[PDB]
Amino acid sequence: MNTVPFTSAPIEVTIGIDQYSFNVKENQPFHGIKDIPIGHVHVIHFQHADNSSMRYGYWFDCRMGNFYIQYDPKDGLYKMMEERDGAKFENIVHNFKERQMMVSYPKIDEDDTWYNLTEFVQMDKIRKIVRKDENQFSYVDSSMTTVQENELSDPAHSLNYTVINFKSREAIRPGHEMEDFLDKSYYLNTVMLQGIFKNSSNYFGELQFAFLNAMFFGNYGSSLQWHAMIELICSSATVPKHMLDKLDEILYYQIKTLPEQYSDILLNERVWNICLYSSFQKNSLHNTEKIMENKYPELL
């Protein structure tokens, strides 16, 4: 069970840790988050009370180093940093714990929600989508654009999601125009799975990461990527049986976790109606179709 200490909390802020969130008051004696489960990526995220604009946050994995948060009054945000001195860090955490200045990661023993949302998500893949190689952790915010959004403008601050475009030479073999457009199995299985992702686990990891950036930061380009990766599977007549069964589980937990009040902006009517009711896989996502019909029958 690992710890992310905070130097201080000089500005009033809502702090998220995965699917949980806590309000901290200006200059409240808050010194961090303890009992963070080992074995998963985590995201620690922030929304300032005085500017509900720019949700921002940090993806990290406590197995990769000792990380803490410190407010920067110049750049006006909570920053993640690595402490390289193991003994200084252990001594900081033990003191803050002794003074009970830390909130406990509030996991219910029964509750597999975070595992279910991050099953395929790996820190090493996050660090290739979010390029800042001198840090072991990854910054994301509401405003960062994707490589695909930038093609259609600062490359260093981009989300380098895999570009998916149904009307592209990559998607459409010369001589198989109609076949490849109406059945994307070639594009899914040869170009994306065998070619780029290497396996379905890396594909699911990117899909799950795109969803979590859409949900936690309202990142519009992440939402586009999540829907494109769903639509590429649902629009393929030929998908391995294990991939369809896993996709149904992935999407079920994503729809279950989504705030009820955000379904209007985070869910694309066209993609979901097409995926559940028209596509090749219309009958392959039983769990997802049932939660969508009971939670968001308006969208459909």
């Binding site: 030479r169 459409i172 125009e177 109609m178 457009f181 109406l182």
Partner: protein, 237 residues
């Protein structure tokens, strides 16, 4: 974006463009079977690909053999149209290739865009105009070459005959659209108007009769009268 009444002069500028109409590609007669079910029998069709500035018509005849053993023919028809338009563009010298292709029906947009991925600088556009190119098979000489075809064939016409010697492209297109709108609304009456006087003939190398400038005004007037009558009936107004 979409071609409409606001950007109509763009048709007659010096940027090569083609209209593509796919409404006569897949043609059927619906009939009863011996068992009293319904079946279709395909007949020969055509892609209507027209340069509105020059009058050059690329009539690609679609022989019924292309449908043999295929499913979802109304869907395939859009993709076959896009395949043949793409083949036509690649067959043209670079300086003759269009800068824009305008499809008369929005369902042609995705099929043509995917077939033309190799031509990213050719714009594929819809139109808000309701163009009467479905009536192309009311032109006797175009109907005759489609129905007689025994294999896939491309036939080149000038749909304006020699009109551009006397009138602008704008006026030639307006005359063509009026003739086709008349033929589409009341084919029998339109064809009566065009041939009633036996002294005015169709040259062997033409589609329409050899009207003088004065006779075209009379004809055009008779076509407008035909269209308004039919309209009063359609709507009871």
């Amino acid at each position: 974006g979409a071609m409409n009444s606001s950007n109509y002069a763009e048709l007659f500028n010096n940027d090569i463009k083609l209209f593509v109409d796919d409404t006569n590609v897949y043609r059927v007669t619906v009939h009863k079977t011996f068992e009293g079910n319904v079946a279709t029998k395909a007949i020969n069709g055509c892609i209507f690909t027209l340069n509105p500035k020059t009058g050059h018509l690329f009539l690609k005849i679609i022989h019924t053999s292309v449908w043999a053993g295929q499913k979802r023919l109304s869907q395939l028809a859009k993709w076959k149209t896009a395949e043949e338009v793409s083949a036509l563009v690649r067959s043209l010298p670079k300086e003759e290739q269009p800068k824009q292709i305008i499809v008369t029906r929005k369902a042609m947009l995705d099929p043509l865009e995917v077939h033309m991925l190799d031509f990213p600088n050719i714009a594929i556009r819809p139109t808000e105009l309701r163009l009467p190119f479905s009536a192309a098979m009311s032109i006797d000489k175009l109907s005759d070459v489609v129905m007689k075809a025994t294999e896939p064939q491309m036939v080149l016409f000038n749909i304006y005959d020699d009109w551009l010697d006397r009138i602008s492209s704008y006026t030639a297109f307006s005359r063509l659209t009026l003739l086709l709108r008349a033929l589409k609304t009341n084919e029998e009456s339109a064809k009566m108007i065009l041939l009633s006087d036996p002294t005015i003939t169709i040259k062997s190398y033409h589609l329409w009769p050899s009207f003088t400038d004065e006779q075209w005004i009379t004809i055009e007037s008779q076509m407008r009268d035909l269209i308004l009558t039919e309209y009063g009936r359609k709507y009871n107004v």
